[PDB]
Amino acid sequence: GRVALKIAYDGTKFHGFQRQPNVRTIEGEILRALKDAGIEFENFKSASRTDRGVSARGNVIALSTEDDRIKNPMVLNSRMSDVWIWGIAEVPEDFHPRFWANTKVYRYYLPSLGMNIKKMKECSLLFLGTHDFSAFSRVDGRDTIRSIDRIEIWEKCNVVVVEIEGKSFLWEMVRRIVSALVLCSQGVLAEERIVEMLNGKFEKSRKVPPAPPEGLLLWDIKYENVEFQIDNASLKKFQREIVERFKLHASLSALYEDLILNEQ
Amino acid sequence: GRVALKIAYDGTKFHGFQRQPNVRTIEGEILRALKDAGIEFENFKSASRTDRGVSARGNVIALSTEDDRIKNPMVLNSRMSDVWIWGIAEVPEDFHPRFWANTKVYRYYLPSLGMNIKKMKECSLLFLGTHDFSAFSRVDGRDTIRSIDRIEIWEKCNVVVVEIEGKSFLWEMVRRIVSALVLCSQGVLAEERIVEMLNGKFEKSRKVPPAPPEGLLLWDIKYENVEFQIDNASLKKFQREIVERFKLHASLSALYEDLILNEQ
Ligand SMILES: [Cl-]
Ligand SMILES: [Cl-]
Ligand SMILES: [Mg+2]
Ligand SMILES: [Mg+2]
């Protein structure tokens, strides 16, 4: 039958999700583990081809196989690093992870140093609802009218987290919205100008550039009437290995922060 | 004449301070910049040979030269990366940075995840004053009686900072004290046992291992009756480049943290 697999990965260890020649990718990591495990499969599909540097908590792939070992994610996880399949769902054969009705959540982790959080939250309200998001996207032939269902901003220590929820996202859309939020928070980009841009009045040559990709996390993809069974062995490995690298960066971040002069 | 130079560096970019063959070191970086600049010098000395991975805000070197360009640190800083000479002092010819009366401050940046801070602060009081620090050091033939003048612990977001001040430190002494603080905070290492160890009663084969070196920062070295003139151009470059890498790690740390399951 067909299975959907919910996957986390450290995007900083890969050259993006989509398989490319001569470089390490998440899809290539997964396909190599499948090949090495001896699992024959058909109709491999992915919910989202995240860009180089972008991480995920709950991206989703789907594949069809008669090999019962696919139901134990550790068969593949033991053959991969920096990628963890931690949820599995049995799904109909016509399940397509990009086209089956779903909601996606992204989180962006923006260093808050010198940020006007209050004004950033005010700017964020402008992006709620249905707009032309062409000015806040990298064009790829898709219709640029999209709807943001939820946009929330909170503070973790040292960073601002921007959470955006919607049924579909244009290329680089979250990271380009985040950059506009930064510019709007520092008075450079007026709210009136954003409203114009969201209604299709902008200059393509001067679009706001995307925020750096390493701060973007694909938080979750929720499919209607689809639930994933969690594999505890896989989560334990995922958690063990993410805690290790969190500790290195938390320590280094705080050390670097203490070297920054107080006034700045 | 003789000059003392106050230097910061990102220890994660080097294989330690002391020059070694075939690897990048802080001393090698500085000596190469001196050679490339055409500055002839004698009697190069360093206050502290920090271990691989250890960073510094205010380590100190001293050298003697008649070349007036040494008074402008940008002559060397423009020929180095990840090292910044930001203070300079004219000193007597018999100034020796390791032996001239001084006080050193170290800070260690320990991830606070699952730490009992209150008990860690209680354990830290045991190390104040004069003790045998052999059990909390890597032996190198030096007398192991030392005095800690100050030991303070506070919380930055996500980490605990351990600040220790003293006139001299044994090899790996701060990092081994930090590990003992961790073990004592989690009930593994009793305060009574630490008091015994600080009085020379311990087993050399079971010494507490050093905390990871990347969390250690040589915060400052203060020489009596010696003041450094600050070079603003050098600080601006130091600050510009430390802020860049702080931002990457602050963002990544917060992203990794959000992937850690709540209960843990
Ligand atoms: Cl994006
Ligand atoms: Cl140490
Ligand atoms: Mg509109
Ligand atoms: Mg004693």
Side-chain angles (χ1 to χ4, degrees):
Chain A
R2 194 152 180 75
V3 290
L5 305 179
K6 190 161 262 188
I7 74 180
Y9 47 81
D10 182 350
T12 72
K13 308 294 170 186
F14 299 93
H15 292 249
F17 184 91
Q18 167 179 357
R19 174 185 80 251
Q20 310 279 4
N22 319 295
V23 294
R24 183 188 197 218
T25 63
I26 292 115
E27 183 176 33
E29 189 90 2
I30 297 174
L31 298 173
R32 179 222 33 159
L34 283 161
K35 186 204 184 105
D36 294 357
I39 298 184
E40 280 206 1
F41 63 94
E42 294 159 312
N43 191 17
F44 185 100
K45 298 296 169 185
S46 64
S48 173
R49 295 169 133 188
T50 56
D51 291 314
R52 177 182 177 176
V54 174
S55 294
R57 166 186 169 279
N59 204 351
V60 175
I61 61 185
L63 62 78
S64 294
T65 185
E66 286 168 0
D67 193 315
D68 280 318
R69 290 178 296 159
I70 199 64
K71 298 168 182 186
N72 175 14
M74 285 303 308
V75 175
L76 299 182
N77 290 332
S78 68
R79 299 169 159 93
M80 305 184 296
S81 303
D82 312 299
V83 183
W84 308 270
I85 301 161
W86 57 270
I88 170 154
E90 297 182 5
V91 290
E93 185 59 29
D94 65 335
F95 178 87
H96 192 305
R98 222 174 102 85
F99 303 148
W100 189 287
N102 66 94
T103 306
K104 304 196 186 52
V105 179
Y106 284 93
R107 295 183 175 184
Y108 193 87
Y109 298 87
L110 181 74
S112 59
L113 177 56
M115 292 289 95
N116 183 336
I117 303 327
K118 194 113 164 182
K119 181 136 212 319
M120 203 182 182
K121 292 180 175 205
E122 297 174 342
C123 300
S124 78
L125 301 168
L126 303 174
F127 295 88
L128 191 66
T130 304
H131 309 276
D132 183 357
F133 283 94
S134 184
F136 305 99
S137 75
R138 183 171 172 187
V139 294
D140 61 2
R142 284 187 283 165
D143 180 15
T144 59
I145 306 303
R146 301 289 156 158
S147 298
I148 285 179
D149 299 321
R150 213 180 178 279
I151 175 157
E152 231 201 301
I153 291 175
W154 63 85
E155 255 187 289
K156 297 237 260 91
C157 82
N158 266 343
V159 308
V160 180
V161 186
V162 183
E163 184 180 65
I164 308 178
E165 186 164 5
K167 297 178 181 182
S168 63
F169 285 87
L170 302 169
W171 196 5
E172 303 187 346
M173 179 164 139
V174 174
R175 295 159 52 198
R176 287 167 182 256
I177 289 173
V178 163
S179 283
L181 291 180
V182 172
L183 296 179
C184 178
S185 72
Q186 54 198 28
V188 180
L189 177 51
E191 296 205 9
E192 292 72 30
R193 188 44 180 152
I194 289 169
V195 164
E196 283 180 346
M197 301 160 84
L198 289 172
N199 287 290
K201 177 183 156 60
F202 64 95
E203 284 178 358
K204 184 179 184 188
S205 64
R206 287 175 191 178
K207 282 157 75 179
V208 169
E214 288 75 22
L216 185 65
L217 177 66
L218 176 45
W219 178 253
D220 193 46
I221 306 175
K222 169 103 179 179
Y223 294 95
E224 63 172 5
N225 311 133
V226 177
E227 288 187 330
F228 294 81
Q229 179 177 11
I230 293 178
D231 186 72
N232 258 6
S234 305
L235 261 187
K236 177 178 190 180
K237 172 158 145 52
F238 172 34
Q239 291 295 122
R240 179 188 341 116
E241 302 179 341
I242 222 72
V243 161
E244 295 172 6
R245 58 196 79 185
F246 160 75
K247 283 177 179 178
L248 171 74
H249 292 280
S251 176
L252 213 47
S253 183
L255 184 154
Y256 288 147
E257 192 205 342
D258 250 9
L259 296 177
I260 299 169
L261 283 191
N262 290 346
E263 268 207 354
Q264 294 169 332
Chain B
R2 194 152 180 75
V3 290
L5 305 179
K6 190 161 262 188
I7 74 180
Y9 47 81
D10 182 350
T12 72
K13 308 294 170 186
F14 299 93
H15 292 249
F17 184 91
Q18 167 179 357
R19 174 185 80 251
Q20 310 279 4
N22 319 295
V23 294
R24 183 188 197 218
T25 63
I26 292 115
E27 183 176 33
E29 189 90 2
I30 297 174
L31 298 173
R32 179 222 33 159
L34 283 161
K35 186 204 184 105
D36 294 357
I39 298 184
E40 280 206 1
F41 63 94
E42 294 159 312
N43 191 17
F44 185 100
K45 298 296 169 185
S46 64
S48 173
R49 295 169 133 188
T50 56
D51 291 314
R52 177 182 177 176
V54 174
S55 294
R57 166 186 169 279
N59 204 351
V60 175
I61 61 185
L63 62 78
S64 294
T65 185
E66 286 168 0
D67 193 315
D68 280 318
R69 290 178 296 159
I70 199 64
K71 298 168 182 186
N72 175 14
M74 285 303 308
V75 175
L76 299 182
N77 290 332
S78 68
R79 299 169 159 93
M80 305 184 296
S81 303
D82 312 299
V83 183
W84 308 270
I85 301 161
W86 57 270
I88 170 154
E90 297 182 5
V91 290
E93 185 59 29
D94 65 335
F95 178 87
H96 192 305
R98 222 174 102 85
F99 303 148
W100 189 287
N102 66 94
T103 306
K104 304 196 186 52
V105 179
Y106 284 93
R107 295 183 175 184
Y108 193 87
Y109 298 87
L110 181 74
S112 59
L113 177 56
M115 292 289 95
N116 183 336
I117 303 327
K118 194 113 164 182
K119 181 136 212 319
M120 203 182 182
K121 292 180 175 205
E122 297 174 342
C123 300
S124 78
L125 301 168
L126 303 174
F127 295 88
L128 191 66
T130 304
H131 309 276
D132 183 357
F133 283 94
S134 184
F136 305 99
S137 75
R138 183 171 172 187
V139 294
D140 61 2
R142 284 187 283 165
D143 180 15
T144 59
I145 306 303
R146 301 289 156 158
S147 298
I148 285 179
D149 299 321
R150 213 181 178 279
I151 175 157
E152 231 201 301
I153 291 175
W154 63 85
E155 255 187 289
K156 297 237 260 91
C157 82
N158 266 343
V159 308
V160 180
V161 186
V162 183
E163 184 180 65
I164 308 178
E165 186 164 5
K167 297 178 181 182
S168 63
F169 285 87
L170 302 169
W171 196 5
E172 303 187 346
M173 179 164 139
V174 174
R175 295 159 52 198
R176 287 167 182 256
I177 289 173
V178 163
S179 283
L181 291 180
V182 172
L183 296 179
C184 178
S185 72
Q186 54 198 28
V188 180
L189 177 51
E191 296 205 9
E192 292 72 30
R193 188 44 180 152
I194 289 169
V195 164
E196 283 180 346
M197 301 160 84
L198 289 172
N199 287 290
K201 177 183 156 60
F202 64 95
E203 284 178 358
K204 184 179 184 188
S205 64
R206 287 175 191 178
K207 282 157 75 179
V208 169
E214 288 75 22
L216 185 65
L217 177 66
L218 176 45
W219 178 253
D220 193 46
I221 306 175
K222 169 103 179 179
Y223 294 95
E224 63 172 5
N225 311 133
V226 177
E227 288 187 330
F228 294 81
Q229 179 177 11
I230 293 178
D231 186 72
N232 258 6
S234 305
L235 261 187
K236 177 178 190 180
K237 172 158 145 52
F238 172 34
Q239 291 295 122
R240 179 188 341 116
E241 302 179 341
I242 222 72
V243 161
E244 295 172 6
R245 58 196 79 185
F246 160 75
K247 283 177 179 178
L248 171 74
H249 292 280
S251 176
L252 213 47
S253 183
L255 184 154
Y256 288 147
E257 192 205 342
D258 250 9
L259 296 177
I260 299 169
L261 283 191
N262 290 346
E263 268 207 354
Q264 294 169 332

